[PDB]
Amino acid sequence: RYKPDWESLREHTVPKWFDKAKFGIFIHWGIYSVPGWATPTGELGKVPMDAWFFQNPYAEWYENSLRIKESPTWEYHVKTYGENFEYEKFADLFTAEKWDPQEWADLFKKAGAKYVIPTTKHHDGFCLWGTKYTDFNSVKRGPKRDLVGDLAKAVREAGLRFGVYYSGGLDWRFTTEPIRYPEDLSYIRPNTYEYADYAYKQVMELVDLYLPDVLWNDMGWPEKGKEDLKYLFAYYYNKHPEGSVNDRWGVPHWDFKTAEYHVNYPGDLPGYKWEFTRGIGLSFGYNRNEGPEHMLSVEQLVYTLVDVVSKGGNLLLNVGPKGDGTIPDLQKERLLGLGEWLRKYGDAIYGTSVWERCCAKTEDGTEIRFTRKCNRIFVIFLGIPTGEKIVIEDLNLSAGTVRHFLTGERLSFKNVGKNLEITVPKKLLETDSITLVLEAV
């Protein structure tokens, strides 16, 4: 058994299934999906933090932006919904009338994802399950439905792993003042013993009702409640050894680390398992203001996934549904495009390990990423070279046999100085889709 102390909990390491999964789907869905609006300012890590909360690109932070008067959100809300329409009132408009969880589960499976993590409770404190610790939840208001539960059944039916996102660090149902500057986060928090118990009780309830594969907390865990985690993590691991927790609790234990947009993104192999998360656009929650110009293209999603994976992480790509339970076409098309590349190149991604190095580039700048499966080394070009002669800078191979991944064709190569030169017939280059993939043995 695991014991409730960090030294014992340290015995639990990231489960094998998570390490091999590589790709998961995040879902930021809640009453903020109804107004579904934000100023698409930029990417976290690139937007100056002196402005960020005033021009917040995260549509799920709508309530916080609403509280800052004369924030673009406040202007939009007053003209659209009125000055007398409290944020909470969106719970009545959040109906999920067109929601079909098996349809989501199928799209995620078709997209190539192996696990799904919905927001059970984001910062606004609204719970997407029939929690018994608050009436501000989807069973008592809005959908009159247990979204977390119904989605967990659908996802598991599709054979995917199901995890839960919980906002332990923030709950605007316990504060009145908005966050305007990063500094405010140091003191505008629930702060009470009451809140530390609520958060513990709610995650315990998520463990009891759905036994999730991942406990993905956000924004730290209330200080007064930190010692509780030893007990919660043991309780969880004893019911579900293959369960896993992220690194946003602020305590000694975690099974995998996280990076969000530019924030904490590794430049090379990090030495521990991690997971990169971002939305398809600049928001997590649905933003009606984003168009294709604010979103990654299929190509960029593939290069992204490849880079993350060659560095040992998983890609946790966020989908932001509308209040009605539908997934916007722009998102769906990107997911399906990724799923297509994965159906074709999945073997060089899933179940792979990192190699000695993650990266290389060709003489004319095409980036290259590596992954491994025992003796097999996959060479994944972020792009398809135009000519047949390829020169990879700073790489030698002692394999004696390099093949073209898709066809299996054995190819001609040789170590030329500090480089590796290979000839790939144009007929093969023409068969690859977004990436030229080679396999060295």
Residues near ligand ZWZ (CB under 6 A): 28, 58, 60, 218-219, 260, 277, 284
Whether 441 contacts 407, CB under 8 Å: no
Rounded least distance, CB 330 to a copy of itself, Å = 37
Tell which one of 130, 270, 346, 351 touches a copy of itself (CB under 8 A).
270
Q: With binding defined as CB under 8 A, does residue 134 bind a copy of itself?
A: no
Tell which one of 94, 165, 254, 381 touches a copy of itself (CB under 8 A).
254
Expressed in percent and rounded to 5, the helix, strand and coil fractions of the chain are 30, 20, 50
Residues in 137-176 that interact with a copy of itself by CB under 8 A: 176
DSSP assignments along 397-415, one per residue: ---S-EEETTT--EEEEEE
6 binds, among ligand ZWZ, a copy of itself, none (CB under 5 to 8 A by kind): a copy of itself
Indicate if the alpha-carbon torsion angle 293, 299, 305, 307 is positive or negative.
negative
For strand 161-162 and strand 115-121, is the pairing parallel, antiparallel, or unpaired?
A: parallel
The Cα–Cα gap between 324 and 399 comes to 54
> Could you tell me the two tokens for 111?
């997209």
Residues in 362-381 that interact with a copy of itself by CB under 8 A: 374-375
For strand 437-440 and strand 389-393, is the pairing parallel, antiparallel, or unpaired?
A: unpaired
Q: Which is nearer to a copy of itself, 211 or 391 (CB)?
A: 211
Tell which one of 150, 228, 432, 439 touches a copy of itself (CB under 8 A).
228
Q: Which is nearer to a copy of itself, 191 or 433 (CB)?
A: 191
Three-state DSSP class for 185? helix
Q: With binding defined as CB under 8 A, does residue 425 bind a copy of itself?
A: no
Rounded least distance, CB 362 to ligand ZWZ, Å = 34
> Could you tell me the two tokens for 19?
């390490």
Q: With binding defined as CB under 8 A, does residue 12 bind a copy of itself?
A: yes
DSSP assignments along 111-170, one per residue: TT-SEEEEEEE-TT--BSS--SS-S-BTTTSTT-S-HHHHHHHHHHHTT-EE-EEE-SS-
Q: Which is nearer to ligand ZWZ, 202 or 362 (CB)?
A: 202
- In the block, tokens 């064709």 appear at 409
- In the block, tokens 């316990």 appear at 174
Span interacting with a copy of itself, options 22-30, 161-169, 232-240, 391-399, rule CB under 8 A? 232-240
Chain centroid to CA 115? 10
Whether 162 contacts 242, CB under 8 Å: no
Q: With CB under 8 A, what is the number of residues at the site for a copy of itself? A: 48
* Binding mask of the shown chain, residues 170 to 209, with x at each position contacting a copy of itself by CB under 8 A: ------xx---x-xx-xxxx-xxxx-xx--xx------x-
Residues in the site for a copy of itself, rule: CB under 8 A? 1, 3-4, 6-7, 10-13, 176-177, 181, 183-184, 186-189, 191-194, 196-197, 200-201, 208, 224, 228, 230-231, 234-235, 238-239, 241, 247, 250-254, 257, 270-272, 374-375
